[PDB]
């Protein structure tokens, strides 16, 4: 059956305005670190990447559905640019950290963590932050991206006028990736 990489997140339903903004942010960042790559899809993590035995994928998804189904949609703000790495410092990310709405993400995490525990999986990061990743690169490029680049990225974001794109984002769904499979579920 195998063990399958499993991750729970909140998709971000990117539309043209956001993608066009990223068309400016990413080349800006690439003047500092050319090898940055745009994310293909956008989401905010609610869990670590864990592994689940194949037999438990559908039960895990159904456990999530049962919990997530009662959780209402909500609004968040993600307009604070951040540079971060993975734990091993072998990948660097540019993302947008959630400010308003963080508390609602924490409530989602509390439910996901319960499902994780129900299946013996690791619960969420001990220092929770939520962020919408925009781009990544191999290696540790924090020093190149933090400082002037970050400030300039933030100023691009701060100059962006349509509040619905980053300032008042209305969540819609939670999704669970397991291997190559993606299981969606609505928020109320
Ligand atoms: Cl590079």
Numbering used by the authors: 78 to 265
Question: What's the publication's text?
Answer:
Mutation of His208 was found to confer the strongest defect in catalysis and was therefore used for crystallization trials, leading to successful structure determination of mutant Usb1 (H208Q) bound to RNA oligonucleotides 5′-UUUU-3′ and 5′-UUUA-3′. The RNAs are bound in the central cleft of Usb1. The n–1 nucleotide binding pocket in both the H208Q-Usb1–UUUU and H208Q-Usb1–UUUA structures are nearly identical (r.m.s.d. = 0.3 Å). The n nucleotide binding pocket reveals the H208Q mutation that was used to generate the trapped Usb1–RNA complex forms hydrogen bonds with a non-bridging oxygen of the labile phosphodiester and the sidechain of Ser206 in both the UA and UU bound structures. Comparison of the wt-Usb1–AMP structure with the H208Q-Usb1–UUUA structure confirmed our hypothesis that the H208Q mutation perturbs the position of the scissile phosphate group and terminal nucleotide by ∼1 Å. In the H208Q structures, Ser210 is 3.7 Å away and cannot hydrogen bond to the phosphate group.
Usb1 is an exoribonuclease that shortens the oligo-uridine tail of U6 snRNA, resulting in a terminal 2′,3′ cyclic phosphate group in most eukaryotes, including humans. We report three high-resolution co-crystal structures of Usb1 complexed with RNA, which show the structural basis for this catalytic preference and unambiguously identify His120 and His208 as catalytic base and acid, respectively.
